[PDB]
Amino acid sequence: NVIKPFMRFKVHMEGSVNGHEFEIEGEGEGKPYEGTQTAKLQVTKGGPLPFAWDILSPQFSKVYTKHPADIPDYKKLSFPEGFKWERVMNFEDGGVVTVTQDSSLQDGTFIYHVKFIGVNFPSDGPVMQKKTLGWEPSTERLYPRDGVLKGEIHKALKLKGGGHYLCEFKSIYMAKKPVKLPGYYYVDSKLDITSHNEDYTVVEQYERTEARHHLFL
Amino acid sequence: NVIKPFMRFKVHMEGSVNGHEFEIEGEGEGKPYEGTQTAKLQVTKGGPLPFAWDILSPQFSKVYTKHPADIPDYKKLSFPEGFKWERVMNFEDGGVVTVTQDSSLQDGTFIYHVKFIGVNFPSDGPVMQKKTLGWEPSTERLYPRDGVLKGEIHKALKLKGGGHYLCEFKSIYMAKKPVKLPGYYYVDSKLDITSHNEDYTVVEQYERTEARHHLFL
Amino acid sequence: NVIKPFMRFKVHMEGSVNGHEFEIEGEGEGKPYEGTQTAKLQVTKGGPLPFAWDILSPQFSKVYTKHPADIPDYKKLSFPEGFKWERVMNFEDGGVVTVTQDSSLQDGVFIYHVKFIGVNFPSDGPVMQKKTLGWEPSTERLYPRDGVLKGEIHKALKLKGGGHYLCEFKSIYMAKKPVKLPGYYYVDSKLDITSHNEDYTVVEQYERTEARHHLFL
Amino acid sequence: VIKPFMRFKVHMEGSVNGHEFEIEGEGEGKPYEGTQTAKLKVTKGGPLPFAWDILSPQFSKVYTKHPADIPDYKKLSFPEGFKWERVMNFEDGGVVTVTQDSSLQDGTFIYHVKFIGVNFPSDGPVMQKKTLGWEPSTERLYPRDGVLKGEIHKALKLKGGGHYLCEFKSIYMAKKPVKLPGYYYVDSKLDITSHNEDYTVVEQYERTEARHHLFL
């Protein structure tokens, strides 16, 4: 309206982990108002990836998040111009990533451009040894700051022997024009790898994602 | 069974913020299995406090948290012996607190000993200028690690002229005897300052707390 | 042997700060063994830059660092194959940067390729308001870890008026073939902007750089 | 104040991983030559179940050698004195805050220290006592918020070889207005000169000097 009850997107990423460059191409679709989507992703360059696909999986779409009527939907309101998002990921073993992303809309399909640099992963750690088994579901804490929208999450990857490998997300969401800002609130997400080929050069994903107030408010 | 539907506690804190020492005495009570409680705190030494009361309020009782029967209640199970808890608080402007606490059971009443060293608060910041107006409610991500329980929270204090002052909590919970650990889960909390005297040398608090799975699990 | 008493280098940077992309091209030269070098940089895309040049200056060459005989010069020994380096920069106001870099030798001229994503700079901060006036000289603490060379530095940019805007550097240096690693030691650096055009689309740099043991060793 | 040789006395109350302890000690040195020694006894909660090295830098930067062109903020603060505070961030999650009062009583420095260290892995170098002293270090200092601050990238040496890393952040606060320095460095080297078997008695020596950057 311009955001419709079902939209597709196209995604191009250029990325690096521990000096190893790579490029990924993909597409996706889902229900902006219900907060459900999928994506199919292809490692078009730099593959097969010598590290855990899981660290990339959350870089591939928060326009698709269900909102109640009283929490302004900053991300949907940014369109048709759209928004950019940027991120820091801090892993507990020193691994650090920054991400920068541009989200725009062309003939009613979203266009995603991602760049990703990851550094300081230990060579014997769960990322470069490929010991991660998916993300736990997560809860983001968001609020307005500095005229834009910010949010953070304590996330966790599951580990082969058991246990968790932890990572802190800090995100910034920046509309390409003035749009109404919401207050302090939460977004729940559960991202799954629904299927993949042997070496993870083709990967399909599913995310559920919904905004809400704190349950005691 | 040892933890009864209604339980009282007493609390003793010795603390320091920015070189300035203080003591606080208090008491409280509520319902361990419903996850509600209240408490009255009185500043016995080093009052009136030259910093925001808000940074101390969450150091005054997680034995009182509603658990569903499928989430092992580590803290309740630790009694009669009980548990210790420790914490890091990282404020966005450099302020850092560590906290160490002892929780025991004495004649049917909980005994709390707290010690608290906070450092690096800017002199013109919201803590030392007492510009804070209570915490948002909050959600803690917890998980087992290193034979004990740990949890983190992205918290925030409301700011006079509007805005938020952010603070990350990391907590560690240590039973004094072997007790069953839980898995990956959350805890919702809302702490309110229900009243206070003019210079915050006496303050009443109320907290609601509940353990649960992620909403999409 | 392959590293001569005087060498030139060429550098290509693709960067982004707070969603805003740019390219920079340049060439330099110095004396690898004396630890002195200059460079001239030109912004070829996304100019004039909407942020402080100073955050870019240290991404434009530690092969040019003086080394006593008793400290293995890992960077020099990596050649002719060369080495990659990577970096986290953590600014005190929440600005974060990751950098990834490739360093190779082509016809007796060093070739540098650099990518740079900076996120989460406050809109009114020293960086986006261009209020920085060069770096203090600095001392890096280095050591072998995980089969590569790592080093960290507490740096600071000078501010208009007085004062400092602080920045932690963490760096990883990865030789492209097996080379002898040094032990615990330091590197002193002083980087200067020797000249610049009106809008920092053309800028020249000088760095003096020396390795040494701690003065009391 | 400050005389060419002064004594100090120190009382520490600390906690690591929920285990409390008290320590008592005395020390002496040459405040203008930046050398000093100390002798510490664990008076309570010993033998300590964690590595002594995390405690050793909490036992005196008045004894640091200053060139004449860098204001000696800490010396100037007397007889009133200063306080100092610290955060220690260990690469494996261990965190400490430290708070300290330094005052001059009857020609002798009196030190009160409090220390809460938390979040050390049970299987890590601190709680398994696998450390072997600090590397020498270089601290970066500047004025900020009307006081003096400095930071350091420090490292404990490890049994099987290697390093256990720790960032220090210190705040030094004079009890009266005194002249602030600008941007400079402090080198230090702290040694454990002797200790009894289970570290209930320990002797340290530290050499410390302020300076500009070597290229300045």
mmCIF file of N, CA and C in Angstrom, chain B residues 123-181:
data_model
loop_
_atom_site.group_PDB
_atom_site.id
_atom_site.type_symbol
_atom_site.label_atom_id
_atom_site.label_comp_id
_atom_site.label_asym_id
_atom_site.label_seq_id
_atom_site.Cartn_x
_atom_site.Cartn_y
_atom_site.Cartn_z
ATOM 1 N N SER B 123 30.669 12.308 35.787
ATOM 2 C CA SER B 123 30.166 13.211 36.819
ATOM 3 C C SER B 123 28.940 13.966 36.355
ATOM 4 N N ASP B 124 28.768 14.107 35.051
ATOM 5 C CA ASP B 124 27.620 14.856 34.539
ATOM 6 C C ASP B 124 26.608 13.913 33.881
ATOM 7 N N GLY B 125 26.732 12.621 34.175
ATOM 8 C CA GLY B 125 25.844 11.606 33.642
ATOM 9 C C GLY B 125 24.613 11.372 34.510
ATOM 10 N N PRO B 126 23.622 10.643 33.975
ATOM 11 C CA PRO B 126 22.322 10.452 34.636
ATOM 12 C C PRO B 126 22.353 9.736 35.992
ATOM 13 N N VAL B 127 23.371 8.917 36.238
ATOM 14 C CA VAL B 127 23.503 8.250 37.527
ATOM 15 C C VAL B 127 23.874 9.237 38.631
ATOM 16 N N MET B 128 24.937 10.013 38.423
ATOM 17 C CA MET B 128 25.419 10.964 39.432
ATOM 18 C C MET B 128 24.572 12.220 39.505
ATOM 19 N N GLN B 129 23.869 12.548 38.426
ATOM 20 C CA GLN B 129 22.982 13.709 38.419
ATOM 21 C C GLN B 129 21.554 13.309 38.779
ATOM 22 N N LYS B 130 21.383 12.050 39.168
ATOM 23 C CA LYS B 130 20.084 11.529 39.563
ATOM 24 C C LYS B 130 18.973 11.875 38.551
ATOM 25 N N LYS B 131 19.281 11.764 37.259
ATOM 26 C CA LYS B 131 18.314 12.037 36.201
ATOM 27 C C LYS B 131 17.465 10.840 35.731
ATOM 28 N N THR B 132 17.522 9.702 36.424
ATOM 29 C CA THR B 132 16.782 8.508 35.996
ATOM 30 C C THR B 132 15.374 8.434 36.613
ATOM 31 N N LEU B 133 14.470 7.735 35.917
ATOM 32 C CA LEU B 133 13.069 7.569 36.322
ATOM 33 C C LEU B 133 12.589 6.111 36.201
ATOM 34 N N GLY B 134 13.316 5.163 36.772
ATOM 35 C CA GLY B 134 12.885 3.766 36.780
ATOM 36 C C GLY B 134 13.301 2.965 35.554
ATOM 37 N N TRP B 135 13.321 1.650 35.717
ATOM 38 C CA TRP B 135 13.645 0.712 34.663
ATOM 39 C C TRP B 135 12.402 0.389 33.842
ATOM 40 N N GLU B 136 12.597 0.137 32.546
ATOM 41 C CA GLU B 136 11.588 -0.542 31.748
ATOM 42 C C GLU B 136 11.460 -1.950 32.298
ATOM 43 N N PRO B 137 10.324 -2.610 32.024
ATOM 44 C CA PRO B 137 10.333 -4.039 32.302
ATOM 45 C C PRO B 137 11.342 -4.660 31.340
ATOM 46 N N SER B 138 11.646 -5.942 31.509
ATOM 47 C CA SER B 138 12.846 -6.486 30.948
ATOM 48 C C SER B 138 12.702 -7.977 30.784
ATOM 49 N N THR B 139 13.533 -8.548 29.910
ATOM 50 C CA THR B 139 13.529 -9.990 29.650
ATOM 51 C C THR B 139 14.938 -10.511 29.591
ATOM 52 N N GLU B 140 15.157 -11.590 30.313
ATOM 53 C CA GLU B 140 16.461 -12.108 30.587
ATOM 54 C C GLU B 140 16.558 -13.394 29.820
ATOM 55 N N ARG B 141 17.692 -13.585 29.144
ATOM 56 C CA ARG B 141 17.968 -14.822 28.445
ATOM 57 C C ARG B 141 18.888 -15.635 29.334
ATOM 58 N N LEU B 142 18.464 -16.841 29.724
ATOM 59 C CA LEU B 142 19.231 -17.737 30.606
ATOM 60 C C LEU B 142 19.551 -19.085 29.976
ATOM 61 N N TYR B 143 20.552 -19.763 30.526
ATOM 62 C CA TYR B 143 21.041 -21.024 29.956
ATOM 63 C C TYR B 143 22.043 -21.590 30.947
ATOM 64 N N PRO B 144 22.260 -22.931 30.942
ATOM 65 C CA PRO B 144 23.293 -23.595 31.738
ATOM 66 C C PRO B 144 24.695 -23.500 31.138
ATOM 67 N N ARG B 145 25.680 -23.335 32.015
ATOM 68 C CA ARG B 145 27.051 -23.135 31.585
ATOM 69 C C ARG B 145 27.975 -23.311 32.772
ATOM 70 N N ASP B 146 28.947 -24.217 32.628
ATOM 71 C CA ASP B 146 30.056 -24.329 33.581
ATOM 72 C C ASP B 146 29.527 -24.873 34.911
ATOM 73 N N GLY B 147 28.534 -25.754 34.816
ATOM 74 C CA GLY B 147 27.915 -26.347 35.984
ATOM 75 C C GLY B 147 26.969 -25.450 36.752
ATOM 76 N N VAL B 148 26.749 -24.222 36.280
ATOM 77 C CA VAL B 148 25.870 -23.281 36.967
ATOM 78 C C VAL B 148 24.897 -22.638 35.981
ATOM 79 N N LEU B 149 24.124 -21.673 36.469
ATOM 80 C CA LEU B 149 23.131 -20.977 35.661
ATOM 81 C C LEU B 149 23.581 -19.568 35.351
ATOM 82 N N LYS B 150 23.369 -19.116 34.124
ATOM 83 C CA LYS B 150 23.745 -17.750 33.753
ATOM 84 C C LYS B 150 22.641 -17.098 32.955
ATOM 85 N N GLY B 151 22.611 -15.773 32.962
ATOM 86 C CA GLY B 151 21.608 -15.041 32.214
ATOM 87 C C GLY B 151 22.006 -13.614 31.908
ATOM 88 N N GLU B 152 21.522 -13.102 30.783
ATOM 89 C CA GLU B 152 21.828 -11.728 30.385
ATOM 90 C C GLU B 152 20.562 -10.968 29.989
ATOM 91 N N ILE B 153 20.622 -9.648 30.085
ATOM 92 C CA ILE B 153 19.460 -8.796 29.869
ATOM 93 C C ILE B 153 19.926 -7.485 29.289
ATOM 94 N N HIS B 154 19.254 -6.978 28.260
ATOM 95 C CA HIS B 154 19.491 -5.618 27.832
ATOM 96 C C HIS B 154 18.448 -4.774 28.526
ATOM 97 N N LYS B 155 18.871 -4.052 29.563
ATOM 98 C CA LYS B 155 17.958 -3.235 30.358
ATOM 99 C C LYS B 155 18.076 -1.761 29.987
ATOM 100 N N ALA B 156 17.177 -0.927 30.516
ATOM 101 C CA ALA B 156 17.228 0.517 30.291
ATOM 102 C C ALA B 156 16.482 1.300 31.353
ATOM 103 N N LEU B 157 17.066 2.438 31.698
ATOM 104 C CA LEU B 157 16.480 3.364 32.619
ATOM 105 C C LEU B 157 15.887 4.486 31.797
ATOM 106 N N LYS B 158 14.690 4.915 32.184
ATOM 107 C CA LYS B 158 14.034 6.042 31.545
ATOM 108 C C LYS B 158 14.716 7.316 31.998
ATOM 109 N N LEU B 159 14.710 8.303 31.129
ATOM 110 C CA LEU B 159 15.430 9.520 31.351
ATOM 111 C C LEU B 159 14.555 10.733 31.427
ATOM 112 N N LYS B 160 14.900 11.607 32.345
ATOM 113 C CA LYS B 160 14.055 12.736 32.592
ATOM 114 C C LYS B 160 13.475 13.245 31.303
ATOM 115 N N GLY B 161 14.174 14.131 30.623
ATOM 116 C CA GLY B 161 13.614 14.726 29.432
ATOM 117 C C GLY B 161 13.230 13.742 28.353
ATOM 118 N N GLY B 162 12.990 12.504 28.733
ATOM 119 C CA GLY B 162 12.664 11.484 27.773
ATOM 120 C C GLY B 162 13.938 10.861 27.270
ATOM 121 N N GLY B 163 13.853 9.644 26.747
ATOM 122 C CA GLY B 163 15.065 8.929 26.350
ATOM 123 C C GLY B 163 15.297 7.743 27.244
ATOM 124 N N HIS B 164 16.390 7.047 27.001
ATOM 125 C CA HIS B 164 16.771 5.879 27.777
ATOM 126 C C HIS B 164 18.287 5.861 28.030
ATOM 127 N N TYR B 165 18.681 5.325 29.187
ATOM 128 C CA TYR B 165 20.074 5.132 29.544
ATOM 129 C C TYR B 165 20.256 3.640 29.625
ATOM 130 N N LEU B 166 21.104 3.099 28.771
ATOM 131 C CA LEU B 166 21.133 1.658 28.582
ATOM 132 C C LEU B 166 22.147 0.991 29.474
ATOM 133 N N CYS B 167 21.858 -0.262 29.798
ATOM 134 C CA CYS B 167 22.688 -1.016 30.677
ATOM 135 C C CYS B 167 22.504 -2.481 30.413
ATOM 136 N N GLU B 168 23.608 -3.203 30.243
ATOM 137 C CA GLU B 168 23.595 -4.647 30.076
ATOM 138 C C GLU B 168 23.867 -5.337 31.414
ATOM 139 N N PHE B 169 23.060 -6.347 31.746
ATOM 140 C CA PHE B 169 23.283 -7.173 32.929
ATOM 141 C C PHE B 169 23.835 -8.506 32.498
ATOM 142 N N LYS B 170 24.860 -8.995 33.174
ATOM 143 C CA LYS B 170 25.219 -10.413 33.099
ATOM 144 C C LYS B 170 25.184 -10.961 34.521
ATOM 145 N N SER B 171 24.429 -12.039 34.743
ATOM 146 C CA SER B 171 24.307 -12.644 36.065
ATOM 147 C C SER B 171 24.716 -14.089 36.035
ATOM 148 N N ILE B 172 25.171 -14.570 37.196
ATOM 149 C CA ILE B 172 25.589 -15.959 37.408
ATOM 150 C C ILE B 172 24.907 -16.440 38.693
ATOM 151 N N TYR B 173 24.320 -17.626 38.659
ATOM 152 C CA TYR B 173 23.584 -18.126 39.817
ATOM 153 C C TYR B 173 24.184 -19.457 40.231
ATOM 154 N N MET B 174 24.602 -19.567 41.498
ATOM 155 C CA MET B 174 25.397 -20.719 41.969
ATOM 156 C C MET B 174 24.805 -21.403 43.218
ATOM 157 N N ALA B 175 24.091 -22.499 42.998
ATOM 158 C CA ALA B 175 23.568 -23.307 44.082
ATOM 159 C C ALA B 175 24.714 -23.783 44.986
ATOM 160 N N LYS B 176 24.447 -23.862 46.289
ATOM 161 C CA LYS B 176 25.434 -24.341 47.272
ATOM 162 C C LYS B 176 25.473 -25.870 47.365
ATOM 163 N N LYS B 177 24.677 -26.540 46.538
ATOM 164 C CA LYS B 177 24.672 -27.998 46.423
ATOM 165 C C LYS B 177 24.228 -28.372 45.019
ATOM 166 N N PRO B 178 24.549 -29.593 44.581
ATOM 167 C CA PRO B 178 24.106 -29.992 43.252
ATOM 168 C C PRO B 178 22.595 -29.918 43.149
ATOM 169 N N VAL B 179 22.089 -29.203 42.150
ATOM 170 C CA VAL B 179 20.674 -29.245 41.815
ATOM 171 C C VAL B 179 20.483 -29.205 40.310
ATOM 172 N N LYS B 180 19.392 -29.799 39.845
ATOM 173 C CA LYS B 180 19.114 -29.908 38.418
ATOM 174 C C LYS B 180 19.145 -28.541 37.734
ATOM 175 N N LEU B 181 19.922 -28.453 36.652
ATOM 176 C CA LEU B 181 19.946 -27.281 35.777
ATOM 177 C C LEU B 181 18.824 -27.303 34.705
#
